[PDB]
Write a protein that binds this ligand. Sequence first.
Ligand SMILES: [K+]
Ligand SMILES: [K+]
Ligand SMILES: [K+]
Ligand SMILES: [K+]
Ligand SMILES: [K+]
Ligand SMILES: [K+]
Ligand SMILES: [K+]
Ligand SMILES: [K+]
Ligand SMILES: [Zn+2]
Ligand SMILES: [Zn+2]
Ligand SMILES: [Zn+2]
Ligand SMILES: [Zn+2]
Ligand SMILES: [Zn+2]
Ligand SMILES: [Zn+2]
Ligand SMILES: [Zn+2]
Ligand SMILES: [Zn+2]
Lengths: 370, 370, 370, 370
Amino acid sequence: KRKTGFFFDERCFWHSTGLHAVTLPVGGWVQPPAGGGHAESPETKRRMKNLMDVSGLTPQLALRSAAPASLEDLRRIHPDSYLERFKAISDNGGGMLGKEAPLGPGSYEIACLSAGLACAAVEAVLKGELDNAYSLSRPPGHACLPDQSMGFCFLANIPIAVERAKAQLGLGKVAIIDWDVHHGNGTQHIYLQRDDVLTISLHQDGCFPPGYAGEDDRGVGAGEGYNINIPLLAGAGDDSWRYALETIVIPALARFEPELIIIACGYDANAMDPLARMQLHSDSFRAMTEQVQQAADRLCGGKLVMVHEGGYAESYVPFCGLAVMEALSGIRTEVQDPLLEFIQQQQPRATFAQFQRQAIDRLAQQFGLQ
Amino acid sequence: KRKTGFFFDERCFWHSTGLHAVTLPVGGWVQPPAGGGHAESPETKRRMKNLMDVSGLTPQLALRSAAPASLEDLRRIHPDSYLERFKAISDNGGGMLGKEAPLGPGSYEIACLSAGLACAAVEAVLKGELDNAYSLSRPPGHACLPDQSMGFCFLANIPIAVERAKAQLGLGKVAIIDWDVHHGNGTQHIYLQRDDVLTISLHQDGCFPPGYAGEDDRGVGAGEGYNINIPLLAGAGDDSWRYALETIVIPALARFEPELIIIACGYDANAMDPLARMQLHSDSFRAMTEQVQQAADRLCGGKLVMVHEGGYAESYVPFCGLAVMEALSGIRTEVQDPLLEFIQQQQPRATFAQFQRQAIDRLAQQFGLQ
Amino acid sequence: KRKTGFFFDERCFWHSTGLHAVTLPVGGWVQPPAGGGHAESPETKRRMKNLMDVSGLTPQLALRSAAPASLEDLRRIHPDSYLERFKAISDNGGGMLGKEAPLGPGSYEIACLSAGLACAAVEAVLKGELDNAYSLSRPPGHACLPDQSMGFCFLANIPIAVERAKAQLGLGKVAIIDWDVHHGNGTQHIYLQRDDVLTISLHQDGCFPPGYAGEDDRGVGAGEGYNINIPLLAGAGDDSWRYALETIVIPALARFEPELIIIACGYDANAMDPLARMQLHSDSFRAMTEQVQQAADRLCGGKLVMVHEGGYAESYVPFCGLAVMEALSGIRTEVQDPLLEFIQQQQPRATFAQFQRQAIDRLAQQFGLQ
Amino acid sequence: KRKTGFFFDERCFWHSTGLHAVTLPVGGWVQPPAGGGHAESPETKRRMKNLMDVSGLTPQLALRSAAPASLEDLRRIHPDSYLERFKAISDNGGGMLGKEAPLGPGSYEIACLSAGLACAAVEAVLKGELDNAYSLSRPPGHACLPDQSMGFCFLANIPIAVERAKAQLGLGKVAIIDWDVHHGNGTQHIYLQRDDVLTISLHQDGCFPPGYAGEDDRGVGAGEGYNINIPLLAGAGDDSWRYALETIVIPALARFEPELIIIACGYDANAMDPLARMQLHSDSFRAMTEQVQQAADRLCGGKLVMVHEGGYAESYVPFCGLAVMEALSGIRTEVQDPLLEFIQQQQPRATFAQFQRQAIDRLAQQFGLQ
Ligand SMILES: [K+]
Ligand SMILES: [K+]
Ligand SMILES: [K+]
Ligand SMILES: [K+]
Ligand SMILES: [K+]
Ligand SMILES: [K+]
Ligand SMILES: [K+]
Ligand SMILES: [K+]
Ligand SMILES: [Zn+2]
Ligand SMILES: [Zn+2]
Ligand SMILES: [Zn+2]
Ligand SMILES: [Zn+2]
Ligand SMILES: [Zn+2]
Ligand SMILES: [Zn+2]
Ligand SMILES: [Zn+2]
Ligand SMILES: [Zn+2]
């Protein structure tokens, strides 16, 4: 069975964003935290890898790092003025990169590394070195616009990997499925006019970017039909998210026929996340990984790459990423998620569950899938 | 205008619950936090008072502490075996108090103090020393059963205050309205068979206690009709919570005619809370405080007491408690909640908002109010 | 007995210095802290006041805040270009203020406030409103040069207070005694050429500024003889520090005859401090406060002002500041310093103690006091 | 050149000691920390390994874990009643293990693992698999008595490794050199009556155990002459510690002729440590490692094992352990310790340096080495 790669580097846990009280910059009426405030902490991601190690999983994966993405890699997506300006703050120690977007010293080099991990994960899977692969890419990428940092993201990790594979390995169609709980606004924008990449985003209605739902934004020119947004109702849990995958996402894969499936894998839809209002647990992420691995098996030789995005519950995200790596690798450790049964009990009752399914039905109909 | 009391003591910020990774005890597969993990931190509550101070509000309130609740106060609600056992862990340093319930050294004396603050707040308002009053009671109370600690609560702060007022000041009918996002399971239980206290709970369907909704639990014997549960759908925000107050809660007050309204005032329905999935902001809590103050004005001489319960978003709860104290005191500081506009944009769209209103309509009909 | 003022403001705990791993800025080879790294935390100072409150001491003191120091106050010490530049970083959020000196948003206004507390403490004591007084001035002042921030200090808190008293209340001679464990380099510099202020500094040989001892730096022109440095050997404890006070400091007061004694009161000579290597405990600071209060009683009507400087042991400094406030107020709470006996056992044996005394003897002889 | 082993396991960073304000248990007058208080944090040790990784050093070492020490391994040093009692608290979650000694859930299994790492490090070097070796053994061992936990230590890591090597690999004489800044009281006690292990301890006079210096404690019966204590004066720095090694320690090795040298390698003599008052920097530890490696080269085939003990400066210990691993491996990374020059300037002047040398001279004479 499965040779699964896990692309990670200690340096990615060193990127800092300065002083934050959870999401809020310090000053004015925001008192400095006595804690280690700032949701996008290394700890969310490190805890995952630590739990992989202690669970026994890590030795059974193909561990790898990567060379950082080259200047030329970056330029397939981002214009120089943007790259130069992000490099210039990095080389200061700090400043700010336009409205709500702060880094720290050496964030440039670390963001290039984060994007490189994604690049290498894509390549190893495409070449048949690995059956599938995960990339613990920090900082994340899915909100980054070509010319504007957004949502803790500074480079477009997945698009950079994809355009590199398109240029150096003749990658054809590719589907990017984004189950981070925020909209994949950066991916969507980059591929809006293109029919060669299907971009699909499951997200919390109105969460981030705020007030954006997106269901009627289908793509432009040749790209029309090749973008799919699924604005799930805040509050939704396991039944809704899996219904959405099975009723919309997988059929959408079946129709488009990718050579490769990429997950934008955020865990911030988990039931304890401060940055959204969804009720997923470890088994939810386990199942979704199953659904996309199996589609990948039917459609593109099992070729699945997952790239870490968001996730801000420091105690709970590790149980979710473990489950993901377990489904992805085919290997089951002894860890039992200590909150699984508690979150199962918290799930919306049938009235909501049916309302949400109805809504997902109307979207599948709207997108020509039902 | 308003002489508003604010009952607080430094000692309440000293109660500790040991080593937690947010909600999870440390050990097994739960790695020790490098942060200061444990949601029920002093910081959530201290930050509120700190922001009151820097905003200029604090000097314009009547600040008070209190003698702790007496043994005899405690015994109106709790049996000795329970009190003795909680005292015995407190006097050890720690142990545990049955399934998921941990304290620290001296938590007994501090819980007695927390309950005393609530007692004194009730009395000062009843005697006409104060128009209204808030009690920064930590640890909280609303989940505590007579004989079982639950949900970070060790004593039944509000019932202890109420039965003390019933015995020493001839308090008659009283309504307790609980807008902490978890069920007021402890209040409900204590007053289940009684017609002299109306207990009303707005809470997230199935959140805590897990899997409990409660709409058909109306009370027993004489107490039938005198308990009201409102299980709001996870995901709901400002429109829903205020609709619920106006369509169910206030009419329910109007019908029952209390001599006193007490809020169980949790802030964990705020949009960034890790311990629930609701989307309230500072203006939401401001409005709800307005609605209950005005009912209090019409029905019981303006006599409103608020007692702090839950709230786990360290950066955002202070803006919410400020707003509450501002509505309660009648005084508006210069602070503008820096997330207000962002959370407003995140609010559920009209499809959900109408579904939730419909559900609230059917409950008002079920409870004989519409 | 004693009307003791305690000048403090919540705003002083809001000044931030950004992301630090204890003393080290983040980046390069310095990994971001998962803790709340940065020695100059609010917590060191807040913990002191919290322990005063819970000990029962606080209600028995005259609590006060202050108007911030005026622009004109600041200009008696600092040139405009320096003030304008510090104001400009404050109004950015951050930058940096030359070699190793970082602030946060609104640090300007908070530093003005910190200095105002010292100003008001000096005035209240001088006017006979208060017998004596403490100022919890954060950020500290004693390392600040007129035109350069240094050692976490941005304004010269004590000199600003003194020159304001000199200009508005005809203050004559004043002695400033600095038992912060670092050199009072800022005070020394401001008063180097002046005979009207005696500046005395007890400090760790070579600690901060690094490699500075200072014994032969006595003052310039009229100021010659009116500066006294006492470079204590790293490692020294209670016996040494009290010997130094009694053999050098108090006699030096006796000779100069001040109208006022001011302590630069740092606690970083405590035995657990990461920022020096001295072995003082709570009773050490208690005794030193006694020695200077009694000199003040003999020489200037009991007029003693203490102004908080350094101190970086978060768990231990509060016990030390409590002891100080207890000696200063004349009031003994029930708190017993839980480390007192342990640190007493750690004290240097007689060989060192005698070597240190010898060294202090040779300095008293050198300064014409023995 | 050198095949250097580095024995570490993620599980050792999971051992917890509950709620501490640096060294102080929470309760009474000790306020709960808002930080992550408790000096013996995982972070001190993790930061070292993280910096090894980012510096490029780690891939050039032989990384290994180990099976935990067996029950039988443990019993060569510890009696069952002690083992059973420590196991019983571990299996509770917590309690306490006599006067000032707290663990957490699963500390037993993790302490066995920590001791196993030391066992395996000793064996690999003895068998000629590795030239030398380091063991990141957490929790530490050097203060543990057979029947009493002490100083954050629960098992006697180094003695357990040594007696296992004595029983399974015919290990003869061995020298244990302890440059943790606290006395090696546990090692000393275990080997007090024995001539086959030389135990040498450099430590801060009176620090821990408190009030113990130890110079005249030489050993009992056959063990007389085979224990050496060097009580350095609090305050001492690089010149003193290296003088002590060269004038006492190395000659003492030369005389005894071990088959193996073991360092008890604590970093708490570093200049920023809250738990002692010494002024060492990264180059200090680098040099000491050089001196003992070279003795090892002359005397026992280069066979040197180092086992991690104490070290509580979270930002500075990593630079020190890096330097150690660099000297031990023979490999120099690009990292420059950003505090090296600052701490060099802080070093005691010549008067102290000469006083300390004199004291070390008199000890070498007393021990028959000069
Ligand atoms: K998404
Ligand atoms: K597209
Ligand atoms: K409720
Ligand atoms: K009732
Ligand atoms: K000083
Ligand atoms: K002078
Ligand atoms: K030692
Ligand atoms: K021996
Ligand atoms: Zn996200
Ligand atoms: Zn479920
Ligand atoms: Zn709650
Ligand atoms: Zn709204
Ligand atoms: Zn200082
Ligand atoms: Zn002493
Ligand atoms: Zn040590
Ligand atoms: Zn040096």
